[PDB]
Amino acid sequence: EMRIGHGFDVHAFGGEGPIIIGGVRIPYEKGLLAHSDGDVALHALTDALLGAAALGDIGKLFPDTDPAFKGADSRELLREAWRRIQAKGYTLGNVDVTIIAQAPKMLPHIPQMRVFIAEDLGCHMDDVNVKATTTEKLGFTGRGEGIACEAVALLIK
Amino acid sequence: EMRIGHGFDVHAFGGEGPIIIGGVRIPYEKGLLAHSDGDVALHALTDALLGAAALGDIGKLFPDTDPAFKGADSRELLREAWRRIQAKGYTLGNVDVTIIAQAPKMLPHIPQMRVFIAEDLGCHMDDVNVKATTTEKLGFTGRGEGIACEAVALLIK
Amino acid sequence: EMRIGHGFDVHAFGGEGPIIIGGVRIPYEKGLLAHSDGDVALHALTDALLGAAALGDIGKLFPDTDPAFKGADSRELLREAWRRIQAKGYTLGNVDVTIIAQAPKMLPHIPQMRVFIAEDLGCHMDDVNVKATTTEKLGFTGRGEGIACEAVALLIK
Ligand SMILES: Nc1ccn([C@@H]2O[C@H](COP(=O)(O)OP(=O)(O)O)[C@@H](O)[C@H]2O)c(=O)n1
Numbered sequence: 001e002m003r004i005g006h007g008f009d010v011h012a013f014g015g016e017g018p019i020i021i022g023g024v025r026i027p028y029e030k031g032l033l034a035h036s037d038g039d040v041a042l043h044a045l046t047d048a049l050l051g052a053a054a055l056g057d058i059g060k061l062f063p064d065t066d067p068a069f070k071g072a073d074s075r076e077l078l079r080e081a082w083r084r085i086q087a088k089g090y091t092l093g094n095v096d097v098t099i100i101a102q103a104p105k106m107l108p109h110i111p112q113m114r115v116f117i118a119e120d121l122g123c124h125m126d127d128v129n130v131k132a133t134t135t136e137k138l139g140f141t142g143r144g145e146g147i148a149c150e151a152v153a154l155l156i157k
Numbered sequence: 158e159m160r161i162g163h164g165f166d167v168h169a170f171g172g173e174g175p176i177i178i179g180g181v182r183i184p185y186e187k188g189l190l191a192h193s194d195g196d197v198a199l200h201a202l203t204d205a206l207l208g209a210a211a212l213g214d215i216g217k218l219f220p221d222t223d224p225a226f227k228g229a230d231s232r233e234l235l236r237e238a239w240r241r242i243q244a245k246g247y248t249l250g251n252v253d254v255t256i257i258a259q260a261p262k263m264l265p266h267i268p269q270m271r272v273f274i275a276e277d278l279g280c281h282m283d284d285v286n287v288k289a290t291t292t293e294k295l296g297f298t299g300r301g302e303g304i305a306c307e308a309v310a311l312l313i314k
Numbered sequence: 315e316m317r318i319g320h321g322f323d324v325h326a327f328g329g330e331g332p333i334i335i336g337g338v339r340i341p342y343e344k345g346l347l348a349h350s351d352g353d354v355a356l357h358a359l360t361d362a363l364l365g366a367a368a369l370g371d372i373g374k375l376f377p378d379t380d381p382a383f384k385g386a387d388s389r390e391l392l393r394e395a396w397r398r399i400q401a402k403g404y405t406l407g408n409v410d411v412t413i414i415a416q417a418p419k420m421l422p423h424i425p426q427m428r429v430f431i432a433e434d435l436g437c438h439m440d441d442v443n444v445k446a447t448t449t450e451k452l453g454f455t456g457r458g459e460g461i462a463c464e465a466v467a468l469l470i471k
Pocket residue numbers: 009010034036043057058059060257258259260261262263264265288289290291292293
């Protein structure tokens with residue numbers, strides 16, 4: 001059996017760079033604001049994975065009032081979600097992530113995100129794809145207020 | 158054979174609450190403007206299912222020209238779509254919905270949404286996932302202008 | 315093996331019509347600005363297909379920088395991407411595209427887009443769905459500033 005999931009996330013710019021996306025530190029004039037590290041790509045991916053498994057979403061796994069994972073980096077959260085998904089009997093088919101950002105340029109950093117994601121999910125780098133697009137200066141991303149990310153995932157059981 | 162579909166919808170706030178999302182009435186300071194009940198979750202889901210089956214979109218199935226569904230609630234629209242999709246020989250793999258709203262909070266209402274959706278599609282609740290995310294006060298969702306929803310579905314033949 | 319992919323694109327209105335969407339010329343008071351024909355639907359679809367095949371994105375394959383692709387139209391790019399994907403051993407499962415635009419009306423033009431996509435991917439028209447939705451005058455699409463498109467694809471290996 002196969003299952004599909006989808007995730008979407010947005011974080012706002014604020015503070016000083018670098019930003020962290022896909023587990024990779026990217027120099028930039030502004031940072032990403034969040035209680036968390038603000039890794040919009042890993043949050044969206046985590047939600048797609050949890051969604052395919054019908055385990056809810058990242059907020060449901062890591063409640064605001066829960067002290068356990070407060071302070072954790074997003075790679076840690078991805079690995080723990082993944083542990084809980086595998087405990088339900090699933091393995092990974094493949095994942096695809098789309099970063100929506102006017103800047104910074106993501107392409108040079110995409111290879112390194114793929115390695116980190118592949119290590120965290122214990123899969124082949126050929127099962128992991130990441131891309132980026134701008135919105136041609138339109139909307140909150142085009143005005144440089146923040147970054148959004150969409151992801152989809154296919155799990156096998 | 159398995160087939161994938163994707164849906165997206167947006168409705169604007171207007172008037173007084175409550176709003177209806179995933180078939181669940183939720184109290185709020187404003188209502189959702191729409192000829193229909195404005196249920197963005199169910200419209201996005203209906204489009205994702207129609208999309209997987211290559212049956213077009215909710216506008217093609219329910220034109221303003223057809224009186225049968227004028228004024229029908231969105232659950233009735235989802236069920237008629239599901240009938241057409243089943244007539245094509247499909248059964249449900251799984252669905253995942255992502256509500257994009259700064260407010261109201263969706264978490265406590267999601268259990269009921271899952272039950273209503275599972276009822277409408279004749280499946281187990283474990284084949285239905287619903288999550289939500291804010292856009293951190295950015296964009297028309299972040300400013301509280303309206304609500305958006307994305308959905309993916311996997312059908313089996 | 316089955317594999318999923320997702321794509322998203324945006325282009326801004328500017329210049330004279332028509333606009334070109336899914337390979338179809340649609341009359342409109344403005345065109346879509348781009349170094350290209352600005353076909354958001356085909357770009358998003360090309361990205362979903364490349365994504366499923368873990369080949370990156372249209373910008374990795376066809377950099378706006380490289381003269382080899384100067385003046386290529388979006389169908390030529392979709393076909394070349396498809397050529398590369400098939401060379402990797404994949405065949406088409408199905409694709410679903412969602413155009414997000416306040417105007418012009420897409421519905422009358424969608425059947426032709428389906429034909430063109432099916433021709434370019436060498437598949438049956440029934441493996442290709444295209445839909446449209448407005449955002450109810452909200453956001454950059456609602457204000458008539460640009461058009462967005464999301465797509466998903468399922469490939470078989
Ligand atoms: N309208 C909404 C928005 C999000 N939420 C929940 O609140 C959690 C956090 O939302 P957020 O948009 O602040 O997420 P982050 O990437 O900051 O963790 C989500 O993961 C959902 O559990 C909700 O229930 N209702």
